[PDB]
Amino acid sequence: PEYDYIRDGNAIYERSFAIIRAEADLSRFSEEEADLAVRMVHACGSVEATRQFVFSPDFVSSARAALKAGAPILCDAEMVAHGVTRARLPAGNEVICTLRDPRTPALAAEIGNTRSAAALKLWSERLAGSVVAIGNAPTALFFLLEMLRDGAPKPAAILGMPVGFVGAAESKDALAENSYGVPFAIVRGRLGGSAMTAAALNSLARPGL
Amino acid sequence: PEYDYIRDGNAIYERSFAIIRAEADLSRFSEEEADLAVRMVHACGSVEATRQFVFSPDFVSSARAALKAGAPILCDAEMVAHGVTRARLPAGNEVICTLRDPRTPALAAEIGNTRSAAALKLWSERLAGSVVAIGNAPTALFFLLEMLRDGAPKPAAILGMPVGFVGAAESKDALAENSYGVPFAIVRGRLGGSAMTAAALNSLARPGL
């Protein structure tokens, strides 16, 4: 029983992107956004997810500029942070997730909110000009909107891609309604997740293969 | 602008599982398998993914027994390993991923295969009786089948859930055709991925919320 498969790593990424291009409806995206689209599709294995992707007008430019500028990537979840291929980052960008910071549970408890949300209080210094990747927790997304509403400094771009059935769609909708002036990208509805978010970051970091 | 959302972490998991139960077709799974199904759906946000889940007859029993027995979870990718909520493991089960072991690139090069695949040569001692979680790399799955064919000791269960467009479906199909006598669980077609795989592991570790 001889298994026949591509044993070549690069050949695998190459055929996979060739395949996603050949099956994915990418016409409504800019060339640049399509790049994110493909990697994102690469990451979830679902070519149809593209129908749910929404990139505000200057989302990739501003988020790519921020990253090239050295802007940190604030992540709501470690998984997102783990999916970020560092060798791809342009400027030794930091990938911060404070979800696991020891003060997070304490904060979540004092504020009456989730750990994912409360963690964002620990973003303070870094919020300004950052690229926010919210790949998992909707409450982190709503919380970021409350901080923005209440005068918090603004991120250069917000990847609003929490996945889920509770608050995921609405938080992303709230983002799209008024992101307080910050370019955004969302995956509509319940889809999203850290793999797709990290893919998105990966492509933002460096377009193409 | 008052954002109204559940600020309660447990309430969020609670409503999400209640929602997945209410929308997900779970009838063809056993009660036990449905548990995996829900968490898996929880993880990708897609209730329809359940249509692609396949649990061999004794997959959950043997994989849950293995884990309760203290069996390690061999993972093809770190992401899978990161999604495994340790506090859930039953018996201080080890979660091994050797994808990043320094000898992996070397091996991939000598064998003429991917790093994900070659890494599995480093599984040797642990393979027997383990629970294999292949959440990302199809070549790791094919390679595991070649090791099994060629006399390698058998895992107690194999989660064959690599996601992808190249080799993902076929490797999972090969698994289902002849897993060399090992219970398996696959996510048919291109869907799969580390979040869903880890969810699967999480549920195997401890059923329910």
Indicate the annotated binding residues of A for substrate: 16, 39
CA distance A190 to chain B (A): 5
Q: Is B1-209 in CATH node 3.40.50.1820?
A: no
Enter the DSSP assignment of B152. P
- Measured distance CA(B162)–CA(B157) in Å, rounded: 15
Name every chain A residue with its beta carbon within 8 A of the beta carbon of B16: 164-166
Q: How far is CA A90 from the centre of its chain?
A: 17
Chain B residues near residue A45 by CB distance under 8 angstroms: 163-165, 168, 189-193
Contacts of B5 in chain A (CB under 8 A): 138-139, 142, 167, 170-171
DSSP state of A122: G
Q: Measured between alpha carbons, how far apart are the two ends of chain A, in Å?
A: 33
Contact residues for B172 (Cβ-Cβ < 8 A; gap 6+): B138, B141, B160, B161, B162, B186, B187, B188, B189, B192
- Sketch the domain layout of chain A as residue ranges: 1-209
Secondary structure class of B136 (helix, strand, coil): coil
| Tokens of residue B144, six digits | 């595991």
- Cα–Cα dist A187/A201, whole Å: 13
Provide φ and ψ at A159, rounded to 5°: -90, 105
Write out the E strands in chain B: 53-55, 73-75, 95-97, 131-134, 157-160, 184-187
CB-facing half-sphere around the CA of B43: CA atoms within 13 A: 30
Angle at which helices A31-44 and A59-68 cross, to 10°: 80
Max CA-CA distance within chain A?
64
Compute the residue count for chain A.
209
Per DSSP, the residues of A123-145 read: GHHHHTT-EEEE-S-HHHHHHHH
Is the CB of A16 less than 8 angstroms away from the CB of B115? Answer: no
List the single best residue of A10, A21, A41, A46 to mutate versus B (max B Cβ within 10 A): A46
Structure resolution, Å: 2.1
- DSSP, collapsed to helix, strand or coil, labels residue B164 as coil
Method: X-ray
Which run of H or E residues covers position B2? none
For residues B50 and B189, the answer to whether their CB atoms sit within 8 Å is no
Q: Taking CB atoms and an 8 Å limit, are B5 and A43 in contact across chains?
A: no
Side-chain half-sphere exposure of A191, counting CA atoms within 13 A: 22
Contact B71, B131 (CB under 8 A): yes
- E strands within B45-183? 53-55, 73-75, 95-97, 131-134, 157-160
Beta bridge partners of A159: A133, A185
Nearest 5°: the CA angle A87, B159, B79 is 20
- Which of A20, A37, A40, A42 does the annotation list as catalytic? A42
Tokens of A73: 């990537």
Q: In whole angstroms, what is the distance from residue A1 CA to residue A90 CA?
A: 45
Question: Which residues of B are known to be catalytic?
Answer: 42
DSSP string, A154-184: PPSEEEE---SSSSHHHHHHHHHH--TT--E
In this complex, do A165 and B8 lie within 8 Å of one another by their Cβ atoms? no
Give just the sign of the alpha carbon dihedral B17, B21, B25, B27. Answer: positive
Could you tell me how far CA A32 lies from the centroid of its own chain? 16
| Nearest by Cα to A126 from A196, A75, A160, A91 | A75
Distance CA A14, CA B166 (A): 9
Name which of B133, B196, A15 is nearest B120 in CA terms.
B133
